[PDB]
Amino acid sequence: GKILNVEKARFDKMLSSQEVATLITALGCGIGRDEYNPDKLRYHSIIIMTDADVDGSHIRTLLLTFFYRQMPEIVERGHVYIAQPPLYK
DNA sequence: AAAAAAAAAAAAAAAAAAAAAAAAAAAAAAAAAAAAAAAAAAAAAAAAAAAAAAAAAAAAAAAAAAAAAAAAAAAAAAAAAAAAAAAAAAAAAAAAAAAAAAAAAAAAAAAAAAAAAA
Structure with missing residues (x-):
């Protein structure tokens, strides 16, 4: 679910x-x-594949905060990726 | 080779926990005013000291409030039953230093393999 801020x-x-x-x-x-x-x-390709709803967006923001603040070099080197699963079919 | 216990299949019973987001309170740990306490200077009211004095204990003796005796009567306090509060005695305990068993790095050397030379 949701992780620490x-x-x-x-x-x-x-x-x-x-x-x-x-x-x-x-x-x-x-x-x-x-x-x-x-x-x-x-892994040189870290992929943040959260759910398509808004809570997935919030968890994505929390993960981005963790990666940026705690591991700035990993974000600067471009290892972090964001998946885009579909919400509707 | 006998006994015993784990685990897994699938419908049933019943539980537990981590985070986000804002606003208020409650613990709990700090700087920092603020006043006791203590060390070390100079400074100044009190004891000393002396001479000089007069205010209250002795003494006579009456008399007037008194403390023991007598009586009646009221009923506070003491000791025996029970029923609560609050503190030492003794035993227990959770982290915590000590010991012992398993995971990761190390190179020496060789089997098997891959590759190429003449």
Whole structure:
């Protein structure tokens, strides 16, 4: 579902299961900002495929905030992508 | 080779949790005024000291409020039953240092493979 707003949440508060899962799977080690190393990114194409409704847009904005604030080099290098599934058939 | 326990199939019973978004309150941790407390200067009312003095305890003795005796009568407090408040004694406990077992990196060297030379 929805994840923490890192702009509002404290750095120590970032100990949820979902952010830990994203940090482990990406393996950039975004936590700490001293073990962070974007060269060890396991996937060079990270795709934010949220639902087509407005809540999907909100979750997309939350993920964009997390990637921009915690992993600025990944966003700057252009590894982040956004999928566009259809709402209607 | 016998016993026992896990797990999985599918219709049933019953539960639990994480975040977003704004506005108000309540804990809980800090700077920072603000006043006690303490160290170290100079400074100044009190004891000392002395001579000089006169105000209240002694003493005579009456008398007038008194503390023991007598009586009647009212009924506060003490000790025995129960029923609550509030504190040491003793035992327990959750993190927390210590120990032991498994995952990841390491190169030495060779089997098998791929590739090419004459």
